[PDB]
Amino acid sequence: ATWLPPR
């Protein structure tokens, strides 16, 4: 995927 959100 893309844009990995923190926590």
N, CA, C, O and CB atoms as a CASP TS submission, in Angstrom:
PFRMAT TS
TARGET T0000
AUTHOR 0000-0000-0000
METHOD Language model
MODEL 1
PARENT N/A
ATOM      1  N   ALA     1       0.840  -1.185   0.000  1.00  0.00           N
ATOM      2  CA  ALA     1       0.000   0.000   0.000  1.00  0.00           C
ATOM      3  C   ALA     1       0.885   1.248   0.000  1.00  0.00           C
ATOM      4  O   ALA     1       2.031   1.220  -0.447  1.00  0.00           O
ATOM      5  CB  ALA     1      -0.955  -0.002   1.221  1.00  0.00           C
ATOM      6  N   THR     2       0.322   2.334   0.511  1.00  0.00           N
ATOM      7  CA  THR     2       1.046   3.591   0.576  1.00  0.00           C
ATOM      8  C   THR     2       0.532   4.443   1.739  1.00  0.00           C
ATOM      9  O   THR     2      -0.490   4.139   2.353  1.00  0.00           O
ATOM     10  CB  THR     2       0.916   4.355  -0.751  1.00  0.00           C
ATOM     11  N   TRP     3       1.267   5.511   2.018  1.00  0.00           N
ATOM     12  CA  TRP     3       0.898   6.411   3.097  1.00  0.00           C
ATOM     13  C   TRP     3       0.582   5.564   4.332  1.00  0.00           C
ATOM     14  O   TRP     3      -0.570   5.224   4.599  1.00  0.00           O
ATOM     15  CB  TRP     3      -0.321   7.313   2.694  1.00  0.00           C
ATOM     16  N   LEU     4       1.634   5.238   5.070  1.00  0.00           N
ATOM     17  CA  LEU     4       1.482   4.437   6.272  1.00  0.00           C
ATOM     18  C   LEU     4       1.266   5.361   7.472  1.00  0.00           C
ATOM     19  O   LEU     4       2.157   6.110   7.872  1.00  0.00           O
ATOM     20  CB  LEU     4       2.720   3.527   6.488  1.00  0.00           C
ATOM     21  N   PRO     5       0.035   5.282   8.043  1.00  0.00           N
ATOM     22  CA  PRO     5      -0.312   6.101   9.193  1.00  0.00           C
ATOM     23  C   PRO     5       0.351   5.571  10.465  1.00  0.00           C
ATOM     24  O   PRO     5       0.428   4.364  10.692  1.00  0.00           O
ATOM     25  CB  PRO     5      -1.830   6.152   9.367  1.00  0.00           C
ATOM     26  N   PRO     6       0.835   6.527  11.302  1.00  0.00           N
ATOM     27  CA  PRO     6       1.490   6.169  12.549  1.00  0.00           C
ATOM     28  C   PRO     6       0.469   5.720  13.595  1.00  0.00           C
ATOM     29  O   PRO     6      -0.557   6.367  13.809  1.00  0.00           O
ATOM     30  CB  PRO     6       2.307   7.351  13.075  1.00  0.00           C
ATOM     31  N   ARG     7       0.778   4.602  14.236  1.00  0.00           N
ATOM     32  CA  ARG     7      -0.100   4.056  15.256  1.00  0.00           C
ATOM     33  C   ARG     7      -1.464   3.714  14.655  1.00  0.00           C
ATOM     34  O   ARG     7      -2.350   3.237  15.365  1.00  0.00           O
ATOM     35  CB  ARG     7      -0.256   5.050  16.419  1.00  0.00           C
TER
END
